[PDB]
Design a binder for this molecule. Structure first.
Ligand SMILES: O=P(O)(O)O[C@H]1[C@H](O)[C@@H](OP(=O)(O)O)[C@H](OP(=O)(O)O)[C@@H](OP(=O)(O)O)[C@H]1O
Length: 1329
């Protein structure tokens, strides 16, 4: 074996020789190419290259000597030290270039700043054949320093390999000394040599090194440390080393042992949650963790750092490196590509000339074919190129650069006279709608008029634009730098049918937009309508209710007994409007039948509308048998249910109906018994006339309550509620197709039950808190505890008030919404429903029976946070968060303790098992230390200071000195493992439980301080306001998600995107990250102080709202009429986990991930700017506006980074992403007060931005009446123009039809007490026209 060891050393020496040979051959080839292609004023060339020729010749002689030395092939009996010494003097050639290198690199930097000389250098580099993208000139230029610093290393290496019997060792050592002296005499080589020697010393500490040497592909030790990992279902602590394109982890015990390393280019970075545990984590919770991949082993692993700061350091460094290298290589390749395109264009045109015309239609005849031979002869002839190979390689690049191609496209570029063709010959070789829409909006958004009526030929033209002035303004805002940009934009606009001359051009010609031409048919109405959304579900054979034509108006034929339609309350004799959100009153009868058949085969959940009126008269037979319904509320009674399969269906009886009069009897104020007695069944028996009947309930809230607890005609005058003032529109598309913008305004169907359940969750949470606080406090000081108990009684009183509000809000049915208060009064259930909530829908219907498209864009409305009847607050929030973190940490620590105890049981062997246990124990100790620090946080210290007036078995100083005890326990664990692993589990339990006791002490003190520093009035107000905001958010997202599940919602139609894909994509985008809420508050804080304070409150309540989290859980019912989304609440304030219980069809369509109830977060976004003209306190209000906008901009930008990262992890996005980037630039400009001119285009532009994203929309205003309808119609109009082919000639046509004719007048129709007015000084785009 020893002979084999000597033979291995011999092989190593041979390897050193072979690599020396290869390196020298490669270097001389580098010099060969550099001199052959390059050797632009000639002084530049000489200064750059200096003395490469003498160096090249020295290396040539050296290589010849070496080659003869290895003659015929390398062996172990050759000598080279003499060859080295002989050239020792010859290496002074390097000094000249080393000195010149500074000037050469500075000159090359200058040239790089020169595009033409740089591209010329690139062309020359590409000519020869070397792929330029591989290496730039700079590496070749700087190579000599590296080569000279490396030769000593090669000498010493070969000396180490050299067998002792071989006498060349002293000679090689002398040569090494000479090379070191030569390197030293030049200080520039000193830096490279010292870096190399330091790296080699670091490697010398590596035991069992593998792979190429570190100095080869590395230059700097970026970072190092210790970091854990999971692998093969096991854990093994490791220390990672960070070198450029190299991640080196070694098994520390020379202090390091090789385990494995990765190349970054085959490396991936993926981040996980703080609290995840999956198969890749082998069911282990993750802290500060992230995922990496080695595609070589095509397996992943997780890396968990000791702290957050450590993880941040690692991510920052690794990113920085990958970012720099990516940017460098992308820039180089793109510059090369653009240069190829430019040169190809120039030369192609030069060939197109008749002079020595090479492009020709020769022979199947091949039009415009050129021979590579004649092409290259011409290129050389013009002096551009000097070698046939240079040109043929360049033509090969062009063919590969998609500039030319073989006639048959079955060959590459060869010097032969092979037929070749350009992509221009065969013809083989957007941002306007958004640009124009914005352009108009911004321009007319200005305060000081700009786009104005002007006198042309002594006759004023209305609202024209001096193209000169257009360019001047475009430059004024940095929107266009040079007049070329503005002129190009104006040319586009002119061809784009937005503006035209009064009779684009860069002079004083005057232009107005076609929209003002319409101002100074294509958008109209058809009808106005009121509807009730009769959500129906499929039955055994049909969807429940047939139809028939009557008065050429689609009407119901009959409703079959025992129908889900009868569940929803579908009558006979009602005109229909929609069927599957698909219009039918503008369609033939048979077409409506086809729509129904298609929905059946698709088994879709219908979302119809109907033609039922605000009052109805009902005649019911009265047998002396049973009531067949119920009633409740001394307030205007509302039918509370109705039997199924009964004449009550026949008579036209439906849940929720609010009876006003019966047989000509005023009851609207009287109680239930009054109407009850009129029925013979009630006369027979008071309550015993309620025969068994499948009871169908107004809301889930009472359906569940009644169901759990249980386990000769009469005229009626019922006043309905929760109706839908449907409008229609019509217009002819820009594509020419026909459209119906079937707007609606629904009121939030499931609104009450949500306020009820949220207040119930508040009550239960407060009750549990009270129970625990009371128990803890029971066991100066006496009066302190008495004060605490008084606070606790106050909490209980708040709980009772919450319960009473729950009862009330269960009682109320009418009116459908909370009237805006005009007077103060004590609290009441109505105070926690949203103030004037609504859902301004939209649709579309134009074919791609025949195919059709659809969409939606909800826009909810709601007044400012309504209530009339911080430092300590942030302290309290800090306590809340600390408690939550501590408890969660205790839970996960217990889980992991169980995991490790099971592992110890399994330990009950190969040393790798001992080492894995060691690493696991180290992780346990690390988590323990983390928890200890969290306990020791200043929040806890202040808490203890607050609790000093209460007896306790632990003190701040006692806890601090417990650190020594914890260190002792850890050392005792170490002693146990050293002596016997069987003593370890007991110490594990001991420490776990002792620290648990510490935790309980801490949270006791935390709760004590919380009570010690809490006030109830502000908390009650805050809960109210959050309740409103969350109600709005929940209903909004309910609507939008329900849209998605129907395969409707579509926020990107400008890319010919089918609805189905848009729905799936948005839904899963949410499931990955979540949803963003855009609150476009339009309040005027400088106007009313009250609205300013309401703005502050809505802002802070949104900030709190961020914590909310949703999740889904199937839920089945046959006992509610027209609500799929049986909402629910649970959890607490800090994390209120709502459950949008959906139904079976509305559960299958849920993406795969969420089907188990996984958190969807919820991000807030608030933007404020007073629509009317700006005209210290108000300065502070404006500053508040700016801060709100800034924070919201940061949050949206972060979500944008997240979304782009998702998609990149997940081509067509180039358009939307660039447009989004421009939008972000616009927003930054707006919010940034860089040196009124911005007007108010922020509102529309930002609305566009959020709609482009997956965001669900929402808007709040002063009073819900005037300041909001305008903005809403504006946004709807812009969406239409941007998404479904409207004629941008009709923009203001739509903008004014809406704000004058459409649903948005029913806000004033159903509401009269409200007080509001339209804007008085708004820009043109807002004011009515
Ligand atoms: O020593 P044994 O008991 O065989 O376990 C080894 C180590 O855990 C390695 O981890 P480390 O690299 O930290 O030393 C791991 O390499 P990876 O982490 O690269 O997967 C091996 O992965 P497999 O070869 O896939 O099992 C695993 O088998």
């Amino acid at each position: 074996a020893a002979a084999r060891e000597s033979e291995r050393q011999l092989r190593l020496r041979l390897c050193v020789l072979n690599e020396i040979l290869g390196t020298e051959r490669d270097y001389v080839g580098t010099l060969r190419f550099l001199q052959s292609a390059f050797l632009l004023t000639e002084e530049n060339v000489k200064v750059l290259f200096s003395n490469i020729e003498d160096i090249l010749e020295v290396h040539k002689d050296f290589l010849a000597a070496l080659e003869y030395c290895l003659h015929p092939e390398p062996q172990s009996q050759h000598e080279l030290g003499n060859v080295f010494l002989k050239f020792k003097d010859k290496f002074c050639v390097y000094e000249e270039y080393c000195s010149n290198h500074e000037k050469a690199l500075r000159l090359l930097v200058e040239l790089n700043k020169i595009p033409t000389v740089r591209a010329f250098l690139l062309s020359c580099m590409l000519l020869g054949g070397r792929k330029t993208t591989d290496i730039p000139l700079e590496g070749y230029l700087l190579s000599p320093i590296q080569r000279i610093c490396k030769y000593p290393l090669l000498l010493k290496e070969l000396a180490k390999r050299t067998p002792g019997k071989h006498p060349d060792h002293p000679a090689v050592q002398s040569a090494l000394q000479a090379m070191k002296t030569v390197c030293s005499n030049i200080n520039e080589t000193k830096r490279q040599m010292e870096k190399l020697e330091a790296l080699e010393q670091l490697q010398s500490h590596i035991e069992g090194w593998e792979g190429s040497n570190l100095t080869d592909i590395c230059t700097q030790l970026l970072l190092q440390g210790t970091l854990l990992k999971i692998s093969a279902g096991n854990i093994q602590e490791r220390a990672f080393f960070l070198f450029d394109n190299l991640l080196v982890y070694c098994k520390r015990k020379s202090l390091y042992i090789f385990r494995g390393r990765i190349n970054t280019e085959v490396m991936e970075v993926e981040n996980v949650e703080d609290g995840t545990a999956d198969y890749h984590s082998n069911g282990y919770t993750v802290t500060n963790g992230w995922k990496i991949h080695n595609t070589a082993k095509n397996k992943w692993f997780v890396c968990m750092a000791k702290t957050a700061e450590e993880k941040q350091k690692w991510l920052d460094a690794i990113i920085r490196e990958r970012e720099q290298r990516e940017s460098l290589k992308l820039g180089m390749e793109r510059d090369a590509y653009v240069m190829i395109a430019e040169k190809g264009e120039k030369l192609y045109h030069m060939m197109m000339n008749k002079k020595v015309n090479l492009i020709k239609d020769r022979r199947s005849t091949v039009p415009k074919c050129f021979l590579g031979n004649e092409f290259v002869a011409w290129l050389l002839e013009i002096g551009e190129i000097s070698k046939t190979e240079e040109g043929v390689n360049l033509g090969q690049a062009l063919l590969e650069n998609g500039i030319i191609h073989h006639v048959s496209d079955k060959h590459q570029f060869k010097n032969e006279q092979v037929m070749y063709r350009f992509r221009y010959d065969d013809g083989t070789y957007e941002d306007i709608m958004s640009k124009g829409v914005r352009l108009y909006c911004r321009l007319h958004s200005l305060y000081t008029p700009v786009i104005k009526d002007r006198d042309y030929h002594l006759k004023t033209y209305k609202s024209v634009l001096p193209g000169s002035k257009l360019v001047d303004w475009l430059l004024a805002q940095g929107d266009c730098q040079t007049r070329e940009e503005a002129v190009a934009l104006g040319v586009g606009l002119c061809n784009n049918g937005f503006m035209h001359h009064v009779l684009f051009r860069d002079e004083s010609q005057y232009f107005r937009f076609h929209a003002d031409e319409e101002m100074e048919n294509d958008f109209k109405l058809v009808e106005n309508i009121l509807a009730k959304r009769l959500l129906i579900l499929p039955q055994e054979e049909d969807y429940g209710f047939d139809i028939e034509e009557k008065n050429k108006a689609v009407v119901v034929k009959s409703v079959q007994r025992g129908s889900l339609a009868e569940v929803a309350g579908l009558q006979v004799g009602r005109k229909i409007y929609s069927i599957n959100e698909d219009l039918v009153f503008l369609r033939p009868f048979s077409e409506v039948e086809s729509i129904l058949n298609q929905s059946f085969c698709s088994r879709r959940p219908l979302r119809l509308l109907v033609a039922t009126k605000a009052k109805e008269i009902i005649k019911i037979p009265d047998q002396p048998d049973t009531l067949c319904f119920q009633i409740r509320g001394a307030a205007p009674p509302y039918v509370y249910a109705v039997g199924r399969g009964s004449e009550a269906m026949a008579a036209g009886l439906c849940a929720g109906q609010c009876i006003l009069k019966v047989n000509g009897s005023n009851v609207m104020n009287d109680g239930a018994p009054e109407v009850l007695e009129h029925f013979q069944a009630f006369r027979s028996r008071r309550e015993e006339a309620l025969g068994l009947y499948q009871w169908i309930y107004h809301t889930h809230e009472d359906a569940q309550e009644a169901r759990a607890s249980q386990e000769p005609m009469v005229t009626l005058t019922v006043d309905n509620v929760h109706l839908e003032h449907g409008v229609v529109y019509e217009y002819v598309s820009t594509a020419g197709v026909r459209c119906h913008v079937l707007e609606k305004i629904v009121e939030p169907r499931g609104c009450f039950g949500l306020t009820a359940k949220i207040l119930e969750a508040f009550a239960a949470n407060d009750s549990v808190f009270v129970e625990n606080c009371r128990r803890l406090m029971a066991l100066p000081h006496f009066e302190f505890r008495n004060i605490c108990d008084t606070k606790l009684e106050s909490i209980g009183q708040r709980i009772a008030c919450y319960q009473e509000f729950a009862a009330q809000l269960k009682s109320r049915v009418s009116p459908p919404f909370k009237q805006a208060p005009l007077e103060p009064h004590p609290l009441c259930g109505l105070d926690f429903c949203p103030t004037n909530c609504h859902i301004n829908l939209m649709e579309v219907s134009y074919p791609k029976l025949n195919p059709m498209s659809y969409t939606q864009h909800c826009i909810t409305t709601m007044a400012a946070p309504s209530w009339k009847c911080q430092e300590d607050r942030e302290i309290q929030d800090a306590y809340l968060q600390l408690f939550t973190k501590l408890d969660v940490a205790l839970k996960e620590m217990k889980q992991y303790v169980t995991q490790i105890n099971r592992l110890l049981s399994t330990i009950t062997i190969p040393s790798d098992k001992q080492d894995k246990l060691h690493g696991c124990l180290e992780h346990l100790f690390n988590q323990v230390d983390s928890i200890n620090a969290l306990l020791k946080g200043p929040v806890m210290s202040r808490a203890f200071e607050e609790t000093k007036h209460f007896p306790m078995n632990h003190s701040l100083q006692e806890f601090k000195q417990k650190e020594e005890c914890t260190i002792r326990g850890r050392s005792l664990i170490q002693i146990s493992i050293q002596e016997d692993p069987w003593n370890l589990p007991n110490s594990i339990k001991t420490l776990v439980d002792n620290i648990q006791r510490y935790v309980e002490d801490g949270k006791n003190q935390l709760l004590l301080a919380l009570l010690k520093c809490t006030d109830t009035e502000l908390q009650l107000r805050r809960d109210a306001i959050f309740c409103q905001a969350l109600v709005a958010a929940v209903c909004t997202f309910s609507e939008q998600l329900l849209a998605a599940l129907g395969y409707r919602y579509n926020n990107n139609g400008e890319y010919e995107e089918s609805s189905r894909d848009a729905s799936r994509k948005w839904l899963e985008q949410v499931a990955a990250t979540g949803v963003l809420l855009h609150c476009q508050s339009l309040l005027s804080p400088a106007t009313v102080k009250e609205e300013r304070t309401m703005l502050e409150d809505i802002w802070v309540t949104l900030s709190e709202l961020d914590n909310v989290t949703f999740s889904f859980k199937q839920l089945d019912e046959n006992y509610v009429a027209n609500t799929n989304v049986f909402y629910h609440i649970e959890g607490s304030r800090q994390a209120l986990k709502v459950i949008f219980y959906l139904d079976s069809y509305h559960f299958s369509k849920l993406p795969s991930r969420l089907e188990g109830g996984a958190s969807l977060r919820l991000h807030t976004a608030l933007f404020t700017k007073v629509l009317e003209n700006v005209e210290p306190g108000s300065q502070a209000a404006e500053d508040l506006q700016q801060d709100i906008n800034a924070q919201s901009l940061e949050k949206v930008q972060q979500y944008y980074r997240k979304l782009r990262a998702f998609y990149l992890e997940r081509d067509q996005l180039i358009r939307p992403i660039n447009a989004l980037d421009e939008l972000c630039r616009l927003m930054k400009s707006f919010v940034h007060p860089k040196p009124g001119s911005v007007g108010a285009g922020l509102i529309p532009i930002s609305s566009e931005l959020c709609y482009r994203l997956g965001a669900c929309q929402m808007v709040m205003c002063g009073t819900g009446m005037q300041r909001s309808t305008l903005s809403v119609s504006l946004e709807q109009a812009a969406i239409l123009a941007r998404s479904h082919g409207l004629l941008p000639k009709c923009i203001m046509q739509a903008t004014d039809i809406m704000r004058k004719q459409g649903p948005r007048v029913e806000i004033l129709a159903k509401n009269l007490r409200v007080k509001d007015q339209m804007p008085q000084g708004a820009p043109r785009l807002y004011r009515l026209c």
